[PDB]
Amino acid sequence: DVSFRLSGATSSSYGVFISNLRKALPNERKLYDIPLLRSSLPGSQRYALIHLTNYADETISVAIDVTNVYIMGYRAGDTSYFFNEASATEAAKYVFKDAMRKVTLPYSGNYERLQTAAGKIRENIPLGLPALDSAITTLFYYNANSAASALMVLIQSTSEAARYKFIEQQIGKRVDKTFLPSLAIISLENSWSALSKQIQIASTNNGQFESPVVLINAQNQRVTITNVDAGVVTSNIALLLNRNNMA
Numbered sequence: 001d002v003s004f005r006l007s008g009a010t011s012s013s014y015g016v017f018i019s020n021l022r023k024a025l026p027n028e029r030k031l032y033d034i035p036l037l038r039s040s041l042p043g044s045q046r047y048a049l050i051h052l053t054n055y056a057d058e059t060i061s062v063a064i065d066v067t068n069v070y071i072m073g074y075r076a077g078d079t080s081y082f083f084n085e086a087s088a089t090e091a092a093k094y095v096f097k098d099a100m101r102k103v104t105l106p107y108s109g110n111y112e113r114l115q116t117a118a119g120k121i122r123e124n125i126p127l128g129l130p131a132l133d134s135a136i137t138t139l140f141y142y143n144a145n146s147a148a149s150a151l152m153v154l155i156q157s158t159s160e161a162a163r164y165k166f167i168e169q170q171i172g173k174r175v176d177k178t179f180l181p182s183l184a185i186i187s188l189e190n191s192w193s194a195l196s197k198q199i200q201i202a203s204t205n206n207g208q209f210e211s212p213v214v215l216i217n218a219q220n221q222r223v224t225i226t227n228v229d230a231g232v233v234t235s236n237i238a239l240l241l242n243r244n245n246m247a
C-alpha cells in the first residue's frame, strides 16, 4: 500500500509519495528508460491501495488498477464507492471486501463524464495540496453534488502526477496555495494513450512515430511531436500504457 498525509506535507514529501506510487506498479520492461506497464494481471496482483489523510486526520483509501493507473473506487469508513463501469465492477470482487455498504457512483471514471456531473471543466478547477485536502474532505463526507469535482482533483493529483513529471512538479509546488492548470497540463492528460502507443511503435521504427501527437506547450503553442528525441519523451512522461491495454 502507499500513503500520503497532508498535515506537515511539503513539496518534497509529495515527491516521495508520487515516486512510491510509481514504484508500486509492475512493469513489462523499459523502453527509452521508461517503464512499460503490464497488459494483464490476475485479480490478486492487479490493484494497489493508496491511503490519503487530510489536515483534520480524515482518511480515504483509493483502489487503483496497476496496468493503467485508473482509479476504480474509494472507501470512507465502512462504505465503498465504485465508478459505474465494467473494470470497477471487476475490482469490487477483489478490494474493500469488508465494507458494509457499497455504492455505485452514477458515472464512469472518464473526464467527459465527470466534467458533466461537476458542471465545471478541468481548467477552472483548482489544484494543489490544499485542493487535495478539500477533495479528501468532500469524498469522506460524501456529498453527491460535490463529488465529481473532488474526484477530478483526486485523479489529477495521483494518477496524472504519476504519469508525468511535469504534472507532479506543478502540483507539489503549491503547498499553501492553489492554481488553475494550464492547457499544457490538460493536453498531457488528454494524450497519454496516444503518446504511449507511438513510443512503443517508435522502438521498432528507429525512434520515429508512425502518427504525430499534437500537444500544447507552456507558451500555449500547439507543438507536433514526432519522435523520441522530443522533450516530452526524454524528460517528462514517466509511465507507458501497454499497446494491448487500449486496443
Ligand SMILES: NC(=O)C1=CN([C@@H]2O[C@@H](COP(=O)(O)OP(=O)(O)OC[C@@H]3O[C@H](n4cnc5c(N)ncnc54)[C@H](OP(=O)(O)O)[C@@H]3O)[C@H](O)[C@@H]2O)C=CC1
Binding pocket: 069, 070, 071, 109, 110, 111, 155, 159, 160, 163, 188, 189, 190, 191, 192, 193, 194, 195, 197, 198, 211, 212, 213, 246
Ligand atoms: N494515431 C494515434 O496516435 C493513435 C493514438 N491512440 C490514442 O488513444 C485514444 C484514446 O486514449 P485515452 O483513453 O483518450 O487516453 P489518455 O492518455 O488521455 O488516458 C490516460 C489517462 O486517462 C486520464 N484519466 C481519466 N479518468 C481517469 C481515472 N478515473 N483514473 C485515472 N486516469 C484517468 C487522462 O486522459 P484522458 O481523459 O484522455 O483519458 C490520462 O492521462 C486517442 O483517440 C488516440 O488517438 C489510438 C489510436 C491511434
